[PDB]
Short mmCIF file of C-alpha atoms and ligand atoms in Angstrom, two decimals:
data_model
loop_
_atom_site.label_atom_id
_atom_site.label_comp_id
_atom_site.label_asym_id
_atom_site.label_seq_id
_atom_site.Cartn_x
_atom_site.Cartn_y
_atom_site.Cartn_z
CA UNK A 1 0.00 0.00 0.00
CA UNK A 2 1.21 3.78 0.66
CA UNK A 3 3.04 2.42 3.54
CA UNK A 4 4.82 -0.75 1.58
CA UNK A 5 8.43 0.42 0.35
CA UNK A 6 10.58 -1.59 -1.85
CA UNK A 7 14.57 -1.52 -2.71
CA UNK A 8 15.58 -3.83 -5.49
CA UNK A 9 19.35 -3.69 -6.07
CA UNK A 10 20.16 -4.48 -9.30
CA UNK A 11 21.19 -2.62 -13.12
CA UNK A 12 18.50 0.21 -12.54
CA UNK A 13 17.29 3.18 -10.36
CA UNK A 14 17.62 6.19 -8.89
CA UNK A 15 20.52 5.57 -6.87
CA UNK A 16 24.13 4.14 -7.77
CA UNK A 17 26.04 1.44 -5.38
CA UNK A 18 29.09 3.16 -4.16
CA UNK A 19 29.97 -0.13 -1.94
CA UNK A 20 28.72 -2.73 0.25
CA UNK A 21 30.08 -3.16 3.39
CA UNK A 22 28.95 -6.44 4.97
CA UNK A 23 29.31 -5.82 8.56
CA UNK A 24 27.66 -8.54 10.55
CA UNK A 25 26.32 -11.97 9.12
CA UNK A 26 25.29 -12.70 5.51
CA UNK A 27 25.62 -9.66 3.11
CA UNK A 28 24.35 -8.75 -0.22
CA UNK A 29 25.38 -9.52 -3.50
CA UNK A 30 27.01 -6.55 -4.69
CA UNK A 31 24.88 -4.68 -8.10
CA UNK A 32 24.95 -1.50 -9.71
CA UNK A 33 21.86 0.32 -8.55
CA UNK A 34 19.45 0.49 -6.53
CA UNK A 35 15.43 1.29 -7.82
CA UNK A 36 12.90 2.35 -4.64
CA UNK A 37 9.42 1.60 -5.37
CA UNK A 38 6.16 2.69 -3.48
CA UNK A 39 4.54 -0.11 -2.86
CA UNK A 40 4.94 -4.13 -3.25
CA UNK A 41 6.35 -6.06 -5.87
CA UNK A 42 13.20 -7.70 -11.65
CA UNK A 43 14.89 -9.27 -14.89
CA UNK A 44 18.49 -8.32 -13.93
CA UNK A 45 17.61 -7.61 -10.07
CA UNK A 46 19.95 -9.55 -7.74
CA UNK A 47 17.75 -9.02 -4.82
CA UNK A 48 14.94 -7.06 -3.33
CA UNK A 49 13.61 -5.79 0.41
CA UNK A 50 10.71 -4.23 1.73
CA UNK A 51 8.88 -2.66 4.65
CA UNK A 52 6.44 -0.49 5.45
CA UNK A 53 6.59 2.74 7.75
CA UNK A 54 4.38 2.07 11.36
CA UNK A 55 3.81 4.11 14.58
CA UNK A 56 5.93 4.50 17.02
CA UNK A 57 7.27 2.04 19.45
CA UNK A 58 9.67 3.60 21.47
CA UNK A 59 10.34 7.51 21.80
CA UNK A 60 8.36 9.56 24.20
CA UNK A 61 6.35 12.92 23.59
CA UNK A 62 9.79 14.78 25.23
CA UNK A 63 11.82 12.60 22.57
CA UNK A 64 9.64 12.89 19.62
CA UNK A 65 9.25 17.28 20.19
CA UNK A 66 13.05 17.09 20.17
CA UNK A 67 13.18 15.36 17.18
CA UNK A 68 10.63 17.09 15.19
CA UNK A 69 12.20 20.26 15.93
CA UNK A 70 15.53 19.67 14.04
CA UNK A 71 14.94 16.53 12.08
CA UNK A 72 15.72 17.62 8.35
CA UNK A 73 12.95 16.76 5.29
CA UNK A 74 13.81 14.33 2.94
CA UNK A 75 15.56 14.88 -1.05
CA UNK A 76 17.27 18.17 -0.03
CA UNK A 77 19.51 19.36 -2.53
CA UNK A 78 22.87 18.72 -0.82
CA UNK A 79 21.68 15.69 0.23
CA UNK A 80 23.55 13.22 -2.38
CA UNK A 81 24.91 10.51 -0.34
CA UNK A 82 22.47 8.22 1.28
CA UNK A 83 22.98 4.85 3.20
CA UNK A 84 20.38 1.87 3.53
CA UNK A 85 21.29 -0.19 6.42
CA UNK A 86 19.30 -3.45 6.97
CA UNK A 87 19.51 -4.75 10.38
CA UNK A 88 18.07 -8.02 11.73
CA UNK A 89 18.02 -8.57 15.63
CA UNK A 90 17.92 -11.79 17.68
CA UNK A 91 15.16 -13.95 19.07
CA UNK A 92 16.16 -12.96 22.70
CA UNK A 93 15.47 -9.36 21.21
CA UNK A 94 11.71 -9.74 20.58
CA UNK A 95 10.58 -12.43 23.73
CA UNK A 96 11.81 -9.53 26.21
CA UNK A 97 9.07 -7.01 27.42
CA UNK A 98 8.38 -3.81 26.58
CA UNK A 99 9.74 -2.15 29.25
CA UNK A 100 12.73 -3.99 28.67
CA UNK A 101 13.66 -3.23 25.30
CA UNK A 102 12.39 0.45 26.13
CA UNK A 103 15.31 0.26 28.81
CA UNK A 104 17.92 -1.11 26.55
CA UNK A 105 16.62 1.18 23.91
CA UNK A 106 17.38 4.55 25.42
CA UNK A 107 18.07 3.84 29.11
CA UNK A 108 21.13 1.85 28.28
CA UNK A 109 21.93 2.62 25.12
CA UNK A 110 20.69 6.29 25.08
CA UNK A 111 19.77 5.09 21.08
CA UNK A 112 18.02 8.82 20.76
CA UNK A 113 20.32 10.90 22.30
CA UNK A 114 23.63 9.71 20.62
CA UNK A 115 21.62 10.35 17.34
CA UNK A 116 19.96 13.11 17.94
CA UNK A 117 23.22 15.19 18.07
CA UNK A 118 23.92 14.08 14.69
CA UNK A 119 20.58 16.23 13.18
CA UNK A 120 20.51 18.12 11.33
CA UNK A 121 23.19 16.55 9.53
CA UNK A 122 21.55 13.45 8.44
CA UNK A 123 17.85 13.01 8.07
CA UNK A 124 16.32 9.09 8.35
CA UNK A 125 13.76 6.84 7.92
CA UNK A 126 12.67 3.48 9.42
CA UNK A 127 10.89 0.72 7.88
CA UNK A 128 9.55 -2.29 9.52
CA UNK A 129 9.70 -5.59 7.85
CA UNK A 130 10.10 -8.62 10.48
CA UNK A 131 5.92 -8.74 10.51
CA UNK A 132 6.54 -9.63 6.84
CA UNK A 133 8.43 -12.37 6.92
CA UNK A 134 11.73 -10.79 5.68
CA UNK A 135 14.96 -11.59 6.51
CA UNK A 136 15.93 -8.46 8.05
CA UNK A 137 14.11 -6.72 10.73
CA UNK A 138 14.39 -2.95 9.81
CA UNK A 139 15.30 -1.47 6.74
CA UNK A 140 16.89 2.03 7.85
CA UNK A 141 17.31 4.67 5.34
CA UNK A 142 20.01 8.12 5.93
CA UNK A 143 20.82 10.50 3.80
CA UNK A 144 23.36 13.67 4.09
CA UNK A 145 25.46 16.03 2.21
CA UNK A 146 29.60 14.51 1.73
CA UNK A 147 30.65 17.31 4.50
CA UNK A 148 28.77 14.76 7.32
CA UNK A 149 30.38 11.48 5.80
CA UNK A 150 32.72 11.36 8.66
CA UNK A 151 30.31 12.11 10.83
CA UNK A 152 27.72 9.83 10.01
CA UNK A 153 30.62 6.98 10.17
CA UNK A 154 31.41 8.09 13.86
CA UNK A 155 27.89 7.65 14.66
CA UNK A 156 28.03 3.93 13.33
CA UNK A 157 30.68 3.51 15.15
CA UNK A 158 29.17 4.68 18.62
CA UNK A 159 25.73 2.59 17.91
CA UNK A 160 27.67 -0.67 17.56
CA UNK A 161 29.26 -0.25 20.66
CA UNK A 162 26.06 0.30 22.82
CA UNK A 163 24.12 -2.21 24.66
CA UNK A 164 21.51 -2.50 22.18
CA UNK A 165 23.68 -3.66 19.37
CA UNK A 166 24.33 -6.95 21.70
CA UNK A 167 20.98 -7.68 20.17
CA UNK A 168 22.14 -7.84 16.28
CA UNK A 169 23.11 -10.38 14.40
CA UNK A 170 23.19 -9.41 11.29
CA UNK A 171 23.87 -6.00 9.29
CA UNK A 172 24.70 -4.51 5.77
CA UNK A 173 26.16 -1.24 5.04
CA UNK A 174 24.77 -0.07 1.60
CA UNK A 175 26.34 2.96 0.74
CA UNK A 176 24.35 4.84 -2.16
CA UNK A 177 24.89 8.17 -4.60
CA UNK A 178 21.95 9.95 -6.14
CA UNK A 179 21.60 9.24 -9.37
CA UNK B 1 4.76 -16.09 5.65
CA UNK B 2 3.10 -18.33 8.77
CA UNK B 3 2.52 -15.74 11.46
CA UNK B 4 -0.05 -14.44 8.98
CA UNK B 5 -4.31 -14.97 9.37
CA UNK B 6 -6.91 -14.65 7.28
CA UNK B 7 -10.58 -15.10 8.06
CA UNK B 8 -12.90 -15.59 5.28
CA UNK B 9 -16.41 -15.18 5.66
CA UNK B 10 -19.04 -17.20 3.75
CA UNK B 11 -20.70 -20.99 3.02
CA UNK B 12 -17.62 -22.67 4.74
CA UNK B 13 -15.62 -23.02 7.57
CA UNK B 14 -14.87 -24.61 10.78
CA UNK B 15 -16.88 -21.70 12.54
CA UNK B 16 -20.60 -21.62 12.59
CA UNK B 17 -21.33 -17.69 12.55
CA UNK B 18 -24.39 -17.23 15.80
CA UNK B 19 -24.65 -13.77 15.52
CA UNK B 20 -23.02 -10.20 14.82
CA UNK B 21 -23.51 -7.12 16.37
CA UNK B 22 -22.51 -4.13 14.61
CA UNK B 23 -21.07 -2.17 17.90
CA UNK B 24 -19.55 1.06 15.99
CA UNK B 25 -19.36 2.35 12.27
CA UNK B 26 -19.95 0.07 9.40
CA UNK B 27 -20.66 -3.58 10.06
CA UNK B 28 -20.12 -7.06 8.10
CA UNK B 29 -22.46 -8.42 6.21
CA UNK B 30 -24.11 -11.51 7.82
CA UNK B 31 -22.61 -14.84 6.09
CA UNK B 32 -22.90 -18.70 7.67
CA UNK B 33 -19.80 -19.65 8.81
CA UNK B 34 -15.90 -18.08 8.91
CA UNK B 35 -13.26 -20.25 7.80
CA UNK B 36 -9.91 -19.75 9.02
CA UNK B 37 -6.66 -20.13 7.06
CA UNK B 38 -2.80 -19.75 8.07
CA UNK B 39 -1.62 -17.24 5.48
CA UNK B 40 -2.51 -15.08 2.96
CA UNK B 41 -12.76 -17.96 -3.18
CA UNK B 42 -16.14 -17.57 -5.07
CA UNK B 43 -19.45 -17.37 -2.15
CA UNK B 44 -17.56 -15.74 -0.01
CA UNK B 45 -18.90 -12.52 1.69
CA UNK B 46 -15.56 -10.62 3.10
CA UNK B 47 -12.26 -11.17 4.15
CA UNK B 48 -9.87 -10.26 6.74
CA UNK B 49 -6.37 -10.76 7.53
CA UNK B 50 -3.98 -9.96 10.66
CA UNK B 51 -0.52 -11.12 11.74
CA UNK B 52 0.94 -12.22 14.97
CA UNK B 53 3.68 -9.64 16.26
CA UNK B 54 5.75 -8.59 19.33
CA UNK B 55 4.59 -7.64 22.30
CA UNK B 56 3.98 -3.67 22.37
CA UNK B 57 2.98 -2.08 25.84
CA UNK B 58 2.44 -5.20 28.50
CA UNK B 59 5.06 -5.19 30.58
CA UNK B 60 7.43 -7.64 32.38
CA UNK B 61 5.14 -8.60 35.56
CA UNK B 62 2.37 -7.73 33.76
CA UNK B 63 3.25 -10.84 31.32
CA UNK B 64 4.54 -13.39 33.80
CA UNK B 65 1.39 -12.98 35.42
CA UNK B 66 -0.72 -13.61 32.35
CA UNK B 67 1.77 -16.52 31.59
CA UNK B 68 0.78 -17.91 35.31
CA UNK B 69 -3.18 -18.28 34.65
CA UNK B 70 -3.59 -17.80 30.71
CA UNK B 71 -5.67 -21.04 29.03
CA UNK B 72 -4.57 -22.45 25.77
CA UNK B 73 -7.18 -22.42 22.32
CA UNK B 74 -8.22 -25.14 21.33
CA UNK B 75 -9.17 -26.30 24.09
CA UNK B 76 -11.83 -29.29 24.14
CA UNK B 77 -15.02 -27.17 26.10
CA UNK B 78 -14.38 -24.10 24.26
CA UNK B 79 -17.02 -24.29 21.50
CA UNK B 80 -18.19 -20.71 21.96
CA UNK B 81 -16.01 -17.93 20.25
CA UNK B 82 -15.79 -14.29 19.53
CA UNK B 83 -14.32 -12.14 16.57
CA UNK B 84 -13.90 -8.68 17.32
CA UNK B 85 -12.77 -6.17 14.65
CA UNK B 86 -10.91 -3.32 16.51
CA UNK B 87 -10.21 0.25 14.26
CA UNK B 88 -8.71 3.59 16.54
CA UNK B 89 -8.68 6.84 15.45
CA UNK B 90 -6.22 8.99 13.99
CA UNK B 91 -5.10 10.00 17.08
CA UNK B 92 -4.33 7.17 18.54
CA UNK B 93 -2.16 6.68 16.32
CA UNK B 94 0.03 10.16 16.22
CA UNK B 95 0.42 10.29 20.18
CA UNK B 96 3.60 8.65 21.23
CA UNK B 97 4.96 5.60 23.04
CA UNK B 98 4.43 6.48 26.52
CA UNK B 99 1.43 8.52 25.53
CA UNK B 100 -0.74 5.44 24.29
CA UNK B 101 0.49 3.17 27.15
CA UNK B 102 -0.71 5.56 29.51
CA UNK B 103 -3.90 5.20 28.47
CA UNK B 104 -3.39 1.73 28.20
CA UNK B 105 -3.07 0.93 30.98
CA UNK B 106 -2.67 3.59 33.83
CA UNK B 107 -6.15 5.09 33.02
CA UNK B 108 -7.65 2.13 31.55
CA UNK B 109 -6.41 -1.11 33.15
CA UNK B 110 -6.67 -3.16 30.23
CA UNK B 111 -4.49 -5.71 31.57
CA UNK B 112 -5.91 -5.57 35.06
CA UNK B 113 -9.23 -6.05 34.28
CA UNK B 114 -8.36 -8.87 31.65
CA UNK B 115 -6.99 -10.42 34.09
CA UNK B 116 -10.42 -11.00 36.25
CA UNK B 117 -11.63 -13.34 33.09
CA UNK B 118 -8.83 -15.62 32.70
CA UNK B 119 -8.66 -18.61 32.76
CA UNK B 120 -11.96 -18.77 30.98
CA UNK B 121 -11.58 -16.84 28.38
CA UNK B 122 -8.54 -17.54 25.88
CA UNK B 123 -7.58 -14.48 23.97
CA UNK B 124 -5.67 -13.89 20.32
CA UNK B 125 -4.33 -10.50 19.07
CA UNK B 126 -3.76 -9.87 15.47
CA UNK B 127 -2.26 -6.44 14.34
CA UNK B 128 -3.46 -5.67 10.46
CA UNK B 129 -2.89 -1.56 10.68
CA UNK B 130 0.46 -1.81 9.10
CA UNK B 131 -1.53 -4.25 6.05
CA UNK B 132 -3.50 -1.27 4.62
CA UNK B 133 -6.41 -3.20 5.84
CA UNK B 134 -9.88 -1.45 6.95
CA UNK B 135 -9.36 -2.76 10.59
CA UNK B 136 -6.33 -1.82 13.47
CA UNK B 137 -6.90 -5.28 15.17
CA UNK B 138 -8.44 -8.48 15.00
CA UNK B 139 -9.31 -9.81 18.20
CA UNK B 140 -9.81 -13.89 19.26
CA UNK B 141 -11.80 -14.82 22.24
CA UNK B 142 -13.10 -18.31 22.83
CA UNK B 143 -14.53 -19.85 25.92
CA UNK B 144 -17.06 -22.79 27.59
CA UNK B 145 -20.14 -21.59 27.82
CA UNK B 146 -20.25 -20.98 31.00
CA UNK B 147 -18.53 -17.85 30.63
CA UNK B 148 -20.41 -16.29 27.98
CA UNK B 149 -22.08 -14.06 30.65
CA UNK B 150 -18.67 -13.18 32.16
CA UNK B 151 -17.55 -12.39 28.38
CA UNK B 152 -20.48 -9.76 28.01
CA UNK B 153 -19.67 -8.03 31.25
CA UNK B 154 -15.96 -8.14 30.20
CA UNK B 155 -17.26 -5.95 27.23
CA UNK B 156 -19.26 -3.16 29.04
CA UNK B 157 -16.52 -2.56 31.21
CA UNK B 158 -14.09 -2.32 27.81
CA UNK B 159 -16.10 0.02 26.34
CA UNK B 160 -16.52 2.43 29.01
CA UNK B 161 -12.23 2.51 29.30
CA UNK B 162 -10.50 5.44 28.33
CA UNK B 163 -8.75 3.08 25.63
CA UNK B 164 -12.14 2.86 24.02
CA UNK B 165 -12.50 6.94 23.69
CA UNK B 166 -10.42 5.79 20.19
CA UNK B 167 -12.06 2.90 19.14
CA UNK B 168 -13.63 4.45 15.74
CA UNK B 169 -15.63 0.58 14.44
CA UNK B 170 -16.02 -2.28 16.40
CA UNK B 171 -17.73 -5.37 15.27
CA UNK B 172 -18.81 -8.30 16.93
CA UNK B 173 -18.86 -11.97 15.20
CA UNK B 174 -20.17 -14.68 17.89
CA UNK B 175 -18.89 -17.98 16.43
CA UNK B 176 -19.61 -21.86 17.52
CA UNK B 177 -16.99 -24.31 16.82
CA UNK B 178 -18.34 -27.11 14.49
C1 HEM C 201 21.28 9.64 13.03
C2 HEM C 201 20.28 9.93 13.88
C3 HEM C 201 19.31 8.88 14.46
C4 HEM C 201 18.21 9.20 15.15
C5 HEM C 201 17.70 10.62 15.48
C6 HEM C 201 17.54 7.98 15.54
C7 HEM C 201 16.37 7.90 16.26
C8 HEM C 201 15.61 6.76 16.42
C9 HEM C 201 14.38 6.66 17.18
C10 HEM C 201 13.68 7.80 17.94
C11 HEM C 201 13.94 5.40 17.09
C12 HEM C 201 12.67 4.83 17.75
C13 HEM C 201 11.52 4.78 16.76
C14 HEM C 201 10.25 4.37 17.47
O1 HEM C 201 10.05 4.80 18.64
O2 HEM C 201 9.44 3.61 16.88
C15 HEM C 201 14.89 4.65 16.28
C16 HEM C 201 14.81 3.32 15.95
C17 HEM C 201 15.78 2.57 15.32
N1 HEM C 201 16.98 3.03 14.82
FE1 HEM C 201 17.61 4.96 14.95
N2 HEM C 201 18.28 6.92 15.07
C18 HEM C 201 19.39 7.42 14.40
C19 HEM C 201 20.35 6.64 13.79
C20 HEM C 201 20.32 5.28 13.59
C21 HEM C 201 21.40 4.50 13.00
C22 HEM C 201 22.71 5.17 12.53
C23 HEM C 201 21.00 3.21 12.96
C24 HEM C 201 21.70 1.93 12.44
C25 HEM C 201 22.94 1.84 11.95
C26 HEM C 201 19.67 3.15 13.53
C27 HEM C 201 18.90 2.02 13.67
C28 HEM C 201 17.66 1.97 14.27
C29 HEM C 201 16.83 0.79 14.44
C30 HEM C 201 17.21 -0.63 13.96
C31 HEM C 201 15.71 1.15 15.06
C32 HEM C 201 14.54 0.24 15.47
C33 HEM C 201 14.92 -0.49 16.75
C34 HEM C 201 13.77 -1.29 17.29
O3 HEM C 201 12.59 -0.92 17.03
O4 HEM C 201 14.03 -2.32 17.97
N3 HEM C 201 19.28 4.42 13.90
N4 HEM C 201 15.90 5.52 15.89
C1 HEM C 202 -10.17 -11.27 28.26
C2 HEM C 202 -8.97 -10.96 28.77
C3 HEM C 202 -8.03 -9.93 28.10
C4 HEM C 202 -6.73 -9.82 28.38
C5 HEM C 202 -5.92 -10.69 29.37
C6 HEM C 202 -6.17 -8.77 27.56
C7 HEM C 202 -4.85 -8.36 27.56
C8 HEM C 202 -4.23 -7.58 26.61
C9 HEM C 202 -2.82 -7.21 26.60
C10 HEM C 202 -1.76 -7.62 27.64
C11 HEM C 202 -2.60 -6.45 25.53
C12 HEM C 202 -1.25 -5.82 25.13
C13 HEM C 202 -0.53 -6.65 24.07
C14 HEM C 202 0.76 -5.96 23.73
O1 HEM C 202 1.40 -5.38 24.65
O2 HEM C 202 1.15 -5.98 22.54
C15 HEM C 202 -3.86 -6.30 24.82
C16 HEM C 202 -4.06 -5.59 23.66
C17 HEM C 202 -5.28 -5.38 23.06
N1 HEM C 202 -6.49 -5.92 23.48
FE1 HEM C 202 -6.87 -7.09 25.15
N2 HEM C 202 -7.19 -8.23 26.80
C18 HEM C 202 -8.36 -8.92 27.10
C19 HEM C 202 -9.59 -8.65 26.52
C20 HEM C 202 -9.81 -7.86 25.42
C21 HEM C 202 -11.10 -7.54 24.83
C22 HEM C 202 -12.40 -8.10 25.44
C23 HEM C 202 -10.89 -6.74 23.76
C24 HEM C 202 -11.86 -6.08 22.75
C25 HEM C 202 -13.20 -6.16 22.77
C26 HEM C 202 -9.45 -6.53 23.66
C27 HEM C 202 -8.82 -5.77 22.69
C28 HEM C 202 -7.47 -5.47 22.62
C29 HEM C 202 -6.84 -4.61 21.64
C30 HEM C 202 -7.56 -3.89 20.48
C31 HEM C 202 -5.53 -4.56 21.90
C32 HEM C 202 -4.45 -3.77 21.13
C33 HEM C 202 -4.50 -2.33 21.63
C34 HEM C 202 -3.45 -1.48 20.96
O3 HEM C 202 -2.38 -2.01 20.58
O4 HEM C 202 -3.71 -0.26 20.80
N3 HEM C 202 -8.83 -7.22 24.67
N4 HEM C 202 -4.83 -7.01 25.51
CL1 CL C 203 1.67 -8.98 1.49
#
């Protein structure tokens, strides 16, 4: 529907494959481009994810006014570089409560915080897809001007060293140039 | 994938349709019986479709002690079930996390109250929202019918919640296992 998103990496779309960097688990084939599609759904397509944009799960009304107040729009100019990042988490992940992934979310891992100082450098967009049936559990979506490259790679670097990354077992780095 | 439901109404089924009320906004159309599949045909009135998911306000006590009383389905005396079509509003939807669960639970005792009914009543919760689908929930209640009256006054006291301030259609589909 509106909601359903689509990324087929193969020899056409919007967006050229700078690299793959296959950071935890199995990767993905390496291709050319990759084509986003609105909705659900590839000749020459090597393979192809999807998810759809939900409600929140996590972030409280304090988090989400922060957010909303420096949070950049999507397709800016300068905004050439973007990275998909699929991320899959473990079964130990999704038996625990609420309130305990809410702890490990932010508590522990202070997952908004650490990311909100990178705004308005990078704007972002989460998909959910482990309702689907898809091999990953999020498809995550950033996209920034070259000056915040470095940036944005210090960020990674501070995210997979919290508690929360504990939790996943499998990641891909997909780093993209608009086409 | 196998964490997905749909339930088709019509001519056949394992689910003799008794009666449905039409609660809040636009009903179903009366059919004879629902038939239920695991995933995703011609005389067949509607359909609707929900999948299993993670757990999204209860928390840690507030599971172990529905894991400590909580019935199984299928069991043997429960011939009697219900099918109950949930659909918030808008803005349910928009307020955040610990917004919702407020009302969830601190105003409305959802859980709390549940609890009173178990274990005679066993309960299913399908989330369809995220499907595009004209329905938030789908909702799976079965029970001996003993409890049937218990059921009804389980329902009064859900509708006069806070929670239910949201609830924008609600339909009721009493079923009897065949
Ligand atoms: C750069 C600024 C970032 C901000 C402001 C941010 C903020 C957030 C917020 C508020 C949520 C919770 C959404 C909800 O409540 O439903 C979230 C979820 C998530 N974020 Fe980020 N984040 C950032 C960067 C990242 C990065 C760099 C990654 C991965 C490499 C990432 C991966 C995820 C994942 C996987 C989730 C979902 C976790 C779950 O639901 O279990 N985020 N993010
Ligand atoms: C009979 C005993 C009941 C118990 C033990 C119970 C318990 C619960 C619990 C713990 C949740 C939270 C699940 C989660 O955190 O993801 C929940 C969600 C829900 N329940 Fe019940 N409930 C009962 C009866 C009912 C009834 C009678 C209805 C409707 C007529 C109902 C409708 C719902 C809905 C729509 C949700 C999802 C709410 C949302 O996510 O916004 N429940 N229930
Ligand atoms: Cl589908």
């Amino acid at each position: 529907p509106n909601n359903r998103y689509s990324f087929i990496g193969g020899r056409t779309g919007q967006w050229q494959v700078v690299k793959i960097r296959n950071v935890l688990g199995p990767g993905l084939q390496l291709v050319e481009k990759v084509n986003i599609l609105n909705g659900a759904v590839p000749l020459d397509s090597a393979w192809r994810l999807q998810g759809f944009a939900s409600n929140i799960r996590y972030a409280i009304r304090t988090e989400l006014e922060a957010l909303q107040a420096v949070q950049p729009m999507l397709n800016r100019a300068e905004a050439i570089l973007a990275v998909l990042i699929p991320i899959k988490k473990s079964a130990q992940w999704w038996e625990m409560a609420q309130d305990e992934r809410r702890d490990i979310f932010e508590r522990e891992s202070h997952h908004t915080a650490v990311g909100l100082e990178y705004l308005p450098g990078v704007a972002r967009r989460l998909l959910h897809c482990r309702d689907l049936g898809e091999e990953f559990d999020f498809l995550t979506w950033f996209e920034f001007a070259p000056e915040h490259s470095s940036a944005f790679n210090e960020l990674l670097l501070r995210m997979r060293a919290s508690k929360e990354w504990e939790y996943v077992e499998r990641e891909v780095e997909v780093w993209l140039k608009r086409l």
